[PDB]
Amino acid sequence: HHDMAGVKALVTAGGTREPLDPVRFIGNRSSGKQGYAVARVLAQRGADVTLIAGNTAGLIDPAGVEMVHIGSATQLRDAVSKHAPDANVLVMAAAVADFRPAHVAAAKIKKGASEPSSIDLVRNDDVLAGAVRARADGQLPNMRAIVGFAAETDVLFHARAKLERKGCDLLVVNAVGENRAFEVDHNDGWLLSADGTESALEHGSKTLMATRIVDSIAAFLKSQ
Amino acid sequence: HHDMAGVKALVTAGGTREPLDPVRFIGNRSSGKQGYAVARVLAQRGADVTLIAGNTAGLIDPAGVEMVHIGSATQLRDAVSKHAPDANVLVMAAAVADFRPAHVAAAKIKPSSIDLVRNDDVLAGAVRARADGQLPNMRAIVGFAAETGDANGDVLFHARAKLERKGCDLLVVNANDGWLLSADGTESALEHGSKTLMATRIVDSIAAFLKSQ
Ligand SMILES: Nc1ccn([C@@H]2O[C@H](COP(=O)(O)OP(=O)(O)OP(=O)(O)O)[C@@H](O)[C@H]2O)c(=O)n1
Numbered sequence: 001h002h003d004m005a006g007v008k009a010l011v012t013a014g015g016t017r018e019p020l021d022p023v024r025f026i027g028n029r030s031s032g033k034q035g036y037a038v039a040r041v042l043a044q045r046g047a048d049v050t051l052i053a054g055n056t057a058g059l060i061d062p063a064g065v066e067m068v069h070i071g072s073a074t075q076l077r078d079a080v081s082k083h084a085p086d087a088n089v090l091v092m093a094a095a096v097a098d099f100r101p102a103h104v105a106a107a108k109i110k111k112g113a114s115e116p117s118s119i120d121l122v123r124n125d126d127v128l129a130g131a132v133r134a135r136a137d138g139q140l141p142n143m144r145a146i147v148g149f150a151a152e153t154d155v156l157f158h159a160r161a162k163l164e165r166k167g168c169d170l171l172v173v174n175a176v177g178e179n180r181a182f183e184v185d186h187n188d189g190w191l192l193s194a195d196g197t198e199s200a201l202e203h204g205s206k207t208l209m210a211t212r213i214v215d216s217i218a219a220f221l222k223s224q
Numbered sequence: 225h226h227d228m229a230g231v232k233a234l235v236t237a238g239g240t241r242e243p244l245d246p247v248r249f250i251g252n253r254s255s256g257k258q259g260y261a262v263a264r265v266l267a268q269r270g271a272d273v274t275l276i277a278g279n280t281a282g283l284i285d286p287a288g289v290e291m292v293h294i295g296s297a298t299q300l301r302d303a304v305s306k307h308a309p310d311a312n313v314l315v316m317a318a319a320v321a322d323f324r325p326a327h328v329a330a331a332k333i334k335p336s337s338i339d340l341v342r343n344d345d346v347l348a349g350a351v352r353a354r355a356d357g358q359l360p361n362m363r364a365i366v367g368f369a370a371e372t373g374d375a376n377g378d379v380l381f382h383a384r385a386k387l388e389r390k391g392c393d394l395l396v397v398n399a400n401d402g403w404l405l406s407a408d409g410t411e412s413a414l415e416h417g418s419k420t421l422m423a424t425r426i427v428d429s430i431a432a433f434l435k436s437q
């Protein structure tokens with residue numbers, strides 16, 4: 001079934017890198033492979049896909065997908081607000097850094113002979129929350145589904161609450177792990193819809209979870 | 225020819241990541257490509273190579289090279305001190321982080337500034353160790369640097385200062401050229417080329433410095 005034909009979808013993936021200076025930064029360990037798989041499965045099921053990607057250099061660009069490359073969280077926010085009016089579906093699978101260094105040095109900071117000094121942090125904008133607001137303010141008339149991602153350690157108490165605070169249509173919880181040897185199986189993956197259905201997310205390959213996420217989107221797209 | 229036969233070489237390459245927590249870290253933008261190429265060229269020319277590898281661009285382990293994967297600079301220091309007594313050549317091509325977070329969370333942290341503590345200088349520790357008779361097999365210690373000229377001095381002034389302050393035998397300086405600065409005062413331009421070909425010039429320098437003796 002090519003159930004995503006006629007659907008224009010925008011995906012973010014990978015972690016952001018918040019510059020401290022031209023060489024150093026604060027980043028996170030997200031590989032981006034899971035957002036890549038969602039974009040790959042969407043493209044394979046007929047969607048017109050644009051992928052905004054962060055620290056994902058060694059990944060293969062998915063076939064049939066339009067690539068937009070960013071580095072920072074603010075660049076991701078700026079890139080999403082550009083490509084979002086055209087989308088029917090937003091998939092926020094990127095590990096957006098919640099904070100960035102408050103000051104960026106123009107040159108690399110030389111090692112002192114005396115005490116080092118801290119990196120002051122500043123909040124980055126909530127790209128998911130901004131998109132949800134834009135839609136509610138009538139600014140995204142094409143947006144049919146907004147999908148968020150979360151890593152949670154009940155699970156549903158934290159998961160159900162993120163859904164209400166972000167306000168998106170679906171929250172993918174704990175789609176983490178490659179199902180690799182000696183990675184903990186917390187039987188914790190859930191597909192949380194704003195309508196209140198909970199689906200369990202079988203911790204399997206990145207491809208199978210992507211199929212589950214895209215199954216859920218098309219089913220949410222048909223509910224309306 | 226196989227001019228590096230009989231030589232045990234210990235190489236660091238890539239940047240380190242200093243954890244804040246299981247997800248976040250302080251990192252740098254070093255790709256590691258030039259240390260890997262140095263490790264690849266040394267092996268091909270007969271050396272027994274151990275490559276201590278940190279964060280890379282997704283690089284494949286060079287064939288025939290013993291790989292040690294590290295994450296942090298502290299882990300990198302432990303790995304170097306563990307393998308150094310056996311080595312004849314140390315090539316410090318890793319972008320070792322100067323500072324690390326003062327606290328590491330075991331779980332993910334949901335204004336605070338990040339307090340930092342200084343990391344050990346592994347290249348300098350190696351130079352002092354050799355001079356203290358603790359590394360009798362060490363024949364060459366090679367450091368790496370990327371230097372710019374600025375309001376405080378030109379590129380070459382800053383690079384020489386690095387060699388003089390680090391005390392190593394050879395300093396491979398990037399300014400896409402740069403220089404090869406030797407402890408005898410020899411300064412060669414580093415002709416730009418591929419990572420492979422520039423690695424060839426670096427090893428030729430090491431070989432030529434090994435014949436110094
Ligand atoms: N500055 C941010 C931070 C996160 N996100 C998005 O919001 C979702 C939730 O990410 P999460 O890591 O849970 O961050 P927070 O919800 O802000 O909370 P916490 O940092 O406590 O985990 C993710 O899909 C991410 O793409 C975002 O758009 N902008």
Ligand SMILES: Nc1ccn([C@@H]2O[C@H](COP(=O)(O)OP(=O)(O)OP(=O)(O)O)[C@@H](O)[C@H]2O)c(=O)n1
Nearest residue numbers: 110111316318320343344345346347367368369
């Ligand atoms: N904690 C550190 C920092 C640097 N290095 C090594 O030292 C050499 C020089 O790196 P560089 O950062 O240029 O020297 P620094 O004194 O840290 O330079 P600066 O103060 O300008 O940042 C490199 O081979 C690197 O592998 C190291 O062994 N341990």
Ligand SMILES: O=C(O)C(=O)c1cn(-c2ccc(O)cc2)c2ccc(Br)cc12
Nearest residue numbers: 255256257258259318319368369370398
């Ligand atoms: O490995 C790579 O990808 C790479 O290109 C290089 C990294 N550094 C580097 C290492 C640690 C440091 O502290 C400063 C600079 C280099 C220095 C000279 C040349 Br020539 C090349 C590199």
Ligand SMILES: [Ca+2]
Nearest residue numbers: 095096097098
């Ligand atoms: Ca977050």
Ligand SMILES: [Ca+2]
Nearest residue numbers: 111320321322
């Ligand atoms: Ca430094």
